[PDB]
């Protein structure tokens, strides 16, 4: 290393994606954020104010503060045998709403929906890790006959 400034080792991660330079689209400022929400951190390399350190690129956290211009996010960070809860202040161009609990809200809505419908017996609503296949018949009227081939060189 021998040199460890704030933006060291950032040649590729802070660069823009191919044919995606210039100003951010205006959805970056029309989204509504709320206390307790989950967010992803992704650094946009063209916006230099409130730009988080490279350690936080690609982490997921929770909103603790809603300020006039920036958001406050809590990140769990491992330090040498313990986890630390870190708090940072980041401007809007580097935050996106996160879908880490999207799958869980769809299931909770679907179980209460399928309960309301009762199909008179209640269906099994636990997730199932893929089971071994059941017994079945398959036709061998038309079967292909293959074999190893000879070396060609």
């Amino acid at each position: 290393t021998h040199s460890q400034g704030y933006r060291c080792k950032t040649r590729y991660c802070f660069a823009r994606k191919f044919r995606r330079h210039g100003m951010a689209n205006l959805t970056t400022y029309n989204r509504v954020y709320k206390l307790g929400q989950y967010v992803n951190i992704k650094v946009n390399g063209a916006y230099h104010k409130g730009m988080p350190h490279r350690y936080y690129n690609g982490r997921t956290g929770t909103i603790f503060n809603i300020g006039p211009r920036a958001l406050g996010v809590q990140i769990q960070k491992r330090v040498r045998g313990r986890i630390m809860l870190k708090r940072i202040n980041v401007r809007l161009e580097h935050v996106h709403p996160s879908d880490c609990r999207k799958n869980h809200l769809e299931r909770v809505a679907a179980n209460d929906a399928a309960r309301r419908l009762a199909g008179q017996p209640v269906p099994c609503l636990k997730r199932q890790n893929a089971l071994p296949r059941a017994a079945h018949v398959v036709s061998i009227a038309s079967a292909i006959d293959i074999t190893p081939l000879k070396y060609d060189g």
Binding site: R19, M23, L26, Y29, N30, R31, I66, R69, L71
Partner: protein, 266 residues
């Protein structure tokens, strides 16, 4: 012989601009500073006063930006002004003032339909008998029901002293809308006092009537060429202030919009 600038490598790396930037219809630097709002104001609507001019017409609109579009809450087009008694001269300084007055009155009457106590058209009824003086509806400062607040979005037009964009804003203020502004860029201001009589002259179309008066004096052959539509509605250049004053009163009374049912063709 000569190197070719548009190779297939030039095209592969080319990034297109936003569709409405390629068409030269939107500046996104100014659009970002209009719709921005503090994040502890989570989903409160924010409004813009949009004034656009074309050849043959002047448009005003009140608008709120949403995620995937923006809603027009109200709009007034100056081609409606023929019904209130203004037959010719649309897109001049007076016609821009009247159209902003139409849009402002129409919006406040739309938000006060049914409300009995302290409705937005009784509270802040605007102004009467245009003077061309400074006025600010948010000075009244009712404690419990504030004035409607909007911002002037002028787009690609130049913000010169005496542009028609600012006249249309002025008629919106005189109908009761809180639009923040200063008197600079109006006719009759000298950095040491703003004199309102000079501003009432453009408002009442006085510069138009003096041009016809002199133009008829020397070159009456051009007077037919220059103002043919004025002379076919038989409005003579001495009754404009007569004609504009009646028009404003007929606007405040019935701001409501009557929809022209229409038939198209491909």
């Amino acid at each position: 012989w000569v190197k070719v600038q548009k190779t297939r490598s030039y095209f592969k790396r080319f990034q297109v601009q936003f569709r409405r930037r390629r068409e030269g219809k939107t500046d996104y630097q100014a659009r970002k500073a209009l719709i921005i709002q503090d994040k502890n104001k989570y989903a409160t609507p924010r409004y813009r006063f949009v004034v656009r001019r074309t050849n043959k017409d002047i448009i005003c609109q009140v608008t709120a930006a949403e995620l995937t579009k923006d809603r027009v809450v109200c709009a007034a087009y100056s081609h409606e002004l023929p019904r209130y008694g203004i037959p010719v001269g649309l897109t001049n300084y007076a016609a821009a003032y009247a159209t902003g007055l139409l849009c402002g009155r129409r919006l406040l009457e739309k938000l006060s339909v049914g409300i009995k106590e302290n409705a937005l058209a009784q509270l802040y009824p605007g102004l009467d008998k245009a003077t061309g003086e400074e006025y600010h509806p948010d000075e009244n400062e009712n404690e419990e029901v504030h004035a409607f607040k909007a911002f002037l979005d002028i787009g690609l037009a130049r913000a010169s002293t005496g542009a028609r964009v600012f006249a249309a804003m002025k008629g919106a203020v005189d109908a009761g809308l809180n639009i923040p502004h200063s008197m600079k860029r109006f006719p009759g201001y000298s950095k040491d006092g703003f004199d309102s009589s000079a501003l009432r002259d453009r408002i009442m179309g006085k510069h138009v009537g003096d041009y016809m008066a002199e133009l008829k004096a020397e070159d009456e052959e051009t007077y037919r060429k220059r103002f043919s539509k004025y002379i076919a509605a038989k409005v003579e250049p001495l009754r404009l202030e007569a004609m504009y004053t009646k028009a404003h009163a007929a606007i405040r009374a019935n701001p409501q919009a009557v929809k022209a049912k229409f038939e198209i063709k491909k």
